[PDB]
Amino acid sequence: EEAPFVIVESVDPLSGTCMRNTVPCQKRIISENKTDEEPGYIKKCCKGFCIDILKKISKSVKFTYDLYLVTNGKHGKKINGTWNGMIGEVVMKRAYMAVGSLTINEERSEVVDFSVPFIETGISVMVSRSNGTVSPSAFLEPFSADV
Amino acid sequence: LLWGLVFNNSVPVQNPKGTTSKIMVSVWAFFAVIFLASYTANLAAFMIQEEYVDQVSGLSDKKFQRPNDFSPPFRFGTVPNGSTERNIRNNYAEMHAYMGKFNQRGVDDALLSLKTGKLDAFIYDAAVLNYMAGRDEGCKLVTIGSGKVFASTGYGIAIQKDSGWKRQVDLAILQLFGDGEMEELEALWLTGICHNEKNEVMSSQLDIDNMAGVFYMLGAAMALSLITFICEHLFYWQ
Amino acid sequence: WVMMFVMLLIVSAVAVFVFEYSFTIGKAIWLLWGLVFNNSVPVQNPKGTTSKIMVSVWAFFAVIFLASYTANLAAFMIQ
Amino acid sequence: TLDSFMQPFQSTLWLLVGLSVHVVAVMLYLLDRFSTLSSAMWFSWGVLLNSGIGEGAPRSFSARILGMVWAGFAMIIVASYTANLAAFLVLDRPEERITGINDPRLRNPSDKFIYATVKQSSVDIYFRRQVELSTMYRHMEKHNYESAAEAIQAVRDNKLHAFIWDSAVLEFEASQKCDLVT
Amino acid sequence: ANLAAFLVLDRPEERITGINDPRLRNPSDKFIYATVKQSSVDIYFRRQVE
Amino acid sequence: DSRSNAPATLTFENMAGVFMLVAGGIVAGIFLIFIEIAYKRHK
Amino acid sequence: TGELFFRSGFGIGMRKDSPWKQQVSLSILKSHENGFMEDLDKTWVRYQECDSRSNAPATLTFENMAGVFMLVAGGIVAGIFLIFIEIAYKRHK
Amino acid sequence: IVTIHQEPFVYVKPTMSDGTCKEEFTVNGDPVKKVICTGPNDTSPGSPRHTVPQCCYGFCIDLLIKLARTMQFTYEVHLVADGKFGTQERVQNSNKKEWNGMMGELLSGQADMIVAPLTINNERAQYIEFSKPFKYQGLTILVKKEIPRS
Numbered sequence: 001e002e003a004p005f006v007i008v009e010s011v012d013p014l015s016g017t018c019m020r021n022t023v024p025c026q027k028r029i030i031s032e033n034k035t036d037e038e039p040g041y042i043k044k045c046c047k048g049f050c051i052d053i054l055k056k057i058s059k060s061v062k063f064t065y066d067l068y069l070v071t072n073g074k075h076g077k078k079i080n081g082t083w084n085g086m087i088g089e090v091v092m093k094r095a096y097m098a099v100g101s102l103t104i105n106e107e108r109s110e111v112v113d114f115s116v117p118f119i120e121t122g123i124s125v126m127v128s129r130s131n132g133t134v135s136p137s138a139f140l141e142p143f144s145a146d147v
Numbered sequence: 148l149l150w151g152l153v154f155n156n157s158v159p160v161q162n163p164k165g166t167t168s169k170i171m172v173s174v175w176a177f178f179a180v181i182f183l184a185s186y187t188a189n190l191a192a193f194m195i196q197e198e199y200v201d202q203v204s205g206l207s208d209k210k211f212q213r214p215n216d217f218s219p220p221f222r223f224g225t226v227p228n229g230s231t232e233r234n235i236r237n238n239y240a241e242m243h244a245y246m247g248k249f250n251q252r253g254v255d256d257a258l259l260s261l262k263t264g265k266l267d268a269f270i271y272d273a274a275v276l277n278y279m280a281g282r283d284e285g286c287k288l289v290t291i292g293s294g295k296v297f298a299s300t301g302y303g304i305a306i307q308k309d310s311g312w313k314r315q316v317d318l319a320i321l322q323l324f325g326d327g328e329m330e331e332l333e334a335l336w337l338t339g340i341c342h343n344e345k346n347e348v349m350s351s352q353l354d355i356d357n358m359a360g361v362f363y364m365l366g367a368a369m370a371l372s373l374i375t376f377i378c379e380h381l382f383y384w385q
Numbered sequence: 386w387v388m389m390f391v392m393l394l395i396v397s398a399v400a401v402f403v404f405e406y407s408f409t410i411g412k413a414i415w416l417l418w419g420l421v422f423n424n425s426v427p428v429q430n431p432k433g434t435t436s437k438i439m440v441s442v443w444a445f446f447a448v449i450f451l452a453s454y455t456a457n458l459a460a461f462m463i464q
Numbered sequence: 465t466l467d468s469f470m471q472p473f474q475s476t477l478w479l480l481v482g483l484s485v486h487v488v489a490v491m492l493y494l495l496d497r498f499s500t501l502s503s504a505m506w507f508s509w510g511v512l513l514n515s516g517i518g519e520g521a522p523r524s525f526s527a528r529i530l531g532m533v534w535a536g537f538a539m540i541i542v543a544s545y546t547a548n549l550a551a552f553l554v555l556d557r558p559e560e561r562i563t564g565i566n567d568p569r570l571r572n573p574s575d576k577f578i579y580a581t582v583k584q585s586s587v588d589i590y591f592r593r594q595v596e597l598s599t600m601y602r603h604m605e606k607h608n609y610e611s612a613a614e615a616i617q618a619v620r621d622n623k624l625h626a627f628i629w630d631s632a633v634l635e636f637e638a639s640q641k642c643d644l645v646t
Numbered sequence: 647a648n649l650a651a652f653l654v655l656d657r658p659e660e661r662i663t664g665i666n667d668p669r670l671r672n673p674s675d676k677f678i679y680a681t682v683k684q685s686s687v688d689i690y691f692r693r694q695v696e
Numbered sequence: 697d698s699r700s701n702a703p704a705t706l707t708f709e710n711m712a713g714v715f716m717l718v719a720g721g722i723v724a725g726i727f728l729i730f731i732e733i734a735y736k737r738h739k
Numbered sequence: 740t741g742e743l744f745f746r747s748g749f750g751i752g753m754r755k756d757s758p759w760k761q762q763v764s765l766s767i768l769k770s771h772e773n774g775f776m777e778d779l780d781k782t783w784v785r786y787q788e789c790d791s792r793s794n795a796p797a798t799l800t801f802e803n804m805a806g807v808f809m810l811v812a813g814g815i816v817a818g819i820f821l822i823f824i825e826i827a828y829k830r831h832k
Numbered sequence: 833i834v835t836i837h838q839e840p841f842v843y844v845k846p847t848m849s850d851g852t853c854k855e856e857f858t859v860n861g862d863p864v865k866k867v868i869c870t871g872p873n874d875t876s877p878g879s880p881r882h883t884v885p886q887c888c889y890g891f892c893i894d895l896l897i898k899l900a901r902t903m904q905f906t907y908e909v910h911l912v913a914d915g916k917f918g919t920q921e922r923v924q925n926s927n928k929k930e931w932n933g934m935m936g937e938l939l940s941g942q943a944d945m946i947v948a949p950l951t952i953n954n955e956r957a958q959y960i961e962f963s964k965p966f967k968y969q970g971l972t973i974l975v976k977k978e979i980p981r982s
């Protein structure tokens with residue numbers, strides 16, 4: 001889950017499921033550390049832009065899918081010579097794919113294969129707008145230097 | 148007489164006794180009145196609609212390159228464990244250590260801190276920042292410039308290496324652009340309320356930072372006045 | 386406007402008995418009235434310090450008001 | 465309307481402006497003797513106020529160059545004041561008005577925007593049948609009211625942000641009490 | 647004042663909104679627009695029937 | 697029928713902030729008469 | 740005028756099953772992050788000399804001067820004639 | 833390599849008499865690299881076209897030189913025959929269809945790369961392979977500005 005690309009919702013309390021225009025996805029939870037819990041999950045469903053893109057791709061080219069949320073480590077970061085996160089999942093089999101917010105860069109594109117980008121992104125600076133304007137020489141702004 | 152009369156009739160002066168002299172000053176006064184009125188308006192028009200300028204350029208500025216060498220130190224932060232931090236580390240080694248104390252936790256916490264005043268600038272992905280700035284309670288936050296990205300990349304689908312599905316996935320993705328569903332999806336999911344078309348904040352009270360020019364010209368006039376007086380007095384001393 | 390006129394009369398009388406301690410009544414009214422309207426009309430200024438101090442603030446009042454009015458009247462054209 | 469004096473200028477500017485008038489008056493006296501204190505004080509302070517009082521003038525060539533430029537600074541202050549007051553009386557703070565049914569606020573409901581209609585009406589039929597507005601119906605059915613007259617009272621008390629109903633009824637309601645708008 | 651009113655206000659004369667403008671969707675004989683032959687712009691317009 | 701722009705004919709509201717200063721000088725001018733007449737007799 | 744409706748990007752066209760497929764793609768991605776790509780934009784694409792802004796409120800120029808300065812000048816060349824009238828009328832009555 | 837005349841990206845200028853064209857410096861005195869191009873003159877190809885050497889400089893080929901620096905491979909650029917980006921047509925009323933433009937030379941062994949502005953779409957992606965884009969853009973409309981108010 002990240003941005004307006006993937007939004008994770010909660011299950012409707014009545015029917016134990018959730019409505020249309022949404023894909024059910026199951027997020028794993030770990031409770032006990034002394035004795036780890038085997039196949040203990042919770043059920044949710046999530047929607048967003050990438051979900052719609054995946055739905056259209058699956059409708060176009062025929063295949064079946066089953067989303068499941070990441071376990072730990074956000075997107076991905078090479079930590080002491082071992083990946084973790086979404087990239088760590090896909091590079092260690094048992095994932096085979098990955099969707100959502102994941103930029104393309106040289107270091108990350110040497111262990112996986114990327115598709116054609118469907119949006120333009122980058123690095124931007126965000127500041128709070130000041131309740132003022134600029135006018136250092138507004139008095140001399142009108143007229144011309146020759147008159 | 149003429150210089151006082153042109154600038155809206157202030158200083159006292161003795162008028163000429165002659166009749167043709169009285170005639171000429173009349174048309175000169177008409178010209179002066181026309182002149183002045185126009186100038187005032189013009190100034191109203193310039194002031195009424197003036198575009199604002201953000202007080203920062205980009206990632207190559209004195210504010211960023213030299214943080215402490217400024218008036219009240221400039222504070223900014225970045226959420227770690229991401230692509231932006233890795234990109235910043237390689238190309239700007241000096242300014243990476245300065246933001247260690249200002250590492251945030253999440254986007255919501257960073258936005259809250261920016262609203263309160265703990266931070267002054269935020270560095271993160273442009274696509275999400277545009278959405279977050281375009282959908283806010285009020286119009287306090289801006290995206291800098293017109294959205295001049297620095298490291299242009301794009302979001303993609305990660306697939307396992309050496310697999311046949313890559314070509315079909317790429318063709319299916321490329322198909323959507325041609326038929327135009329991408330436009331509909333972007334309009335449905337990424338549009339916001341604001342548009343950032345450089346609207347008039349309707350500035351107020353004309354702080355001292357504006358008329359610094361006119362007081363500088365007055366001071367320069369004073370300097371030349373006493374310089375000329377000293378020179379003339381010493382010349383007349385002989 | 387009408388309260389401005391009546392206060393102009395009041396201030397004229399004020400200047401009258403301030404000068405009491407060739408400027409008695411009509412000339413002074415004419416001068417003050419002239420002073421509001423961009424100082425167009427030639428006048429005969431008094432020669433008392435207290436009278437000058439009294440006239441200065443009226444001057445101020447005149448300058449502020451004229452400015453308001455032009456600006457305010459410009460709004461009708463723009464809306 | 466405005467703060468007659470306080471709106472166009474800061475409080476800090478006036479003291480600087482008032483002090484600056486006193487600065488030159490001291491200087492004008494200096495040039496006269498080097499090559500009338502009250503008379504010189506009247507001149508510079510009088511010019512900025514546009515009032516005509518006083519007969520003293522700088523006879524020496526020293527203050528003639530300085531006196532002329534001082535008159536220019538008098539008009540620039542007043543001229544800027546007039547333009548600023550015009551700018552404040554014309555512009556307005558930006559605001560967002562719902563453009564219609566395709567506005568982003570309604571299409572993707574948040575947790576702080578509430579709108580509803582009258583239960584068991586023709587509006588409920590319109591939204592239920594269409595599929596593209598399925599995400600909009602769920603938010604509406606939780607806050608729907610019982611009657612049109614009761615629902616309008618809720619908008620006044622800030623328990624509801626928007627109300628969807630026929631334009632014929634609502635257009636009449638806006639005129640009677642113009643603290644609402646369509 | 648009148649002078650200020652004349653200065654400030656002006657008419658943009660409806661300088662084309664974009665691809666959904668009514669001037670382009672159903673064209674008359676008083677508006678002409680064209681592109682370069684055998685380009686990617688031709689592929690975009692020809693491929694879809696709308 | 698005020699629509700939304702609604703140009704405002706300014707009322708007495710602005711007059712309070714301006715007429716007080718000029719009216720205040722009247723009661724502040726009579727006080728300085730006493731020092732003026734005293735200074736003439738003193739010097 | 741207007742916004743953008745068909746969004747894509749320029750690319751380096753190569754034939755399929757080419758040995759240069761892998762190396763070229765990595766080189767382009769490296770050029771973006773190290774700042775070399777934006778240097779080209781400043782040199783060849785980014786320099787503006789024409790005025791920005793749509794309305795572009797422009798100050799008055801001499802064209803206004805000719806309409807007003809000539810009027811007062813015309814009085815000067817016409818005022819000299821009137822002086823002769825006054826002095827002639829001075830001795831004529 | 834095969835390129836195309838495009839004003840912002842690929843400039844085309846005639847060479848000097850001796851065979852090496854002019855030396856040029858930027859605003860800050862930075863030398864501008866130039867590559868010899870062998871393209872046909874007489875931009876309208878109706879008249880018999882004769883190849884004539886020229887020299888090019890601009891955005892695309894400056895990127896080409898640095899790209900060729902790391903891979904250590906030489907190059908020799910020429911210009912497309914008829915100045916068409918390329919579309920797929922039908923010829924001689926037959927059952928076989930072929931490309932017409934700079935895409936034909938790439939397919940028919942007369943070229944190996946296209947360092948030129950060539951957008952990515954579904955039609956061209958089934959025959960050639962595209963690299964990651966080095967510049968994002970879109971389509972827009974150009975119209976004449978109105979007259980200012982006197």
Ligand SMILES: *[C@@H]1O[C@H](CO)[C@@H](O[C@@H]2O[C@H](CO)[C@@H](O)[C@H](O)[C@H]2NC(C)=O)[C@H](O)[C@H]1NC(C)=O
Nearest residue numbers: 073074077079225226227228229250251252253
């Ligand atoms: C960024 O990654 C580092 C990895 O070193 C995270 O540090 C760990 O965070 C977890 C969760 O709080 C702790 O249990 C570990 O003990 C931390 N490791 C160390 C060595 O301190 C860090 O929390 C991550 N930060 C964010 C914002 O995701």
Ligand SMILES: CN[C@]1(c2ccccc2Cl)CCCCC1=O
Nearest residue numbers: 155183184187451452455542546
């Ligand atoms: C020409 N004198 C003016 C003026 C002079 C002095 C003070 C205020 C003003 Cl408003 C100049 C600007 C508008 C018209 C006007 O009355």
Ligand SMILES: *[C@@H]1O[C@H](CO)[C@@H](O)[C@H](O)[C@H]1NC(C)=O
Nearest residue numbers: 077078079080081082083084
């Ligand atoms: C780093 O390298 C390997 C795992 O990649 C491991 O043997 C080693 O202990 C790691 N170091 C630390 C400090 O975890």
Ligand SMILES: N[C@@H](CCC(=O)O)C(=O)O
Nearest residue numbers: 101102103229230231272
């Ligand atoms: N979108 C980034 C993570 C967020 C960031 O680094 O700003 C990535 O793909 O790594």
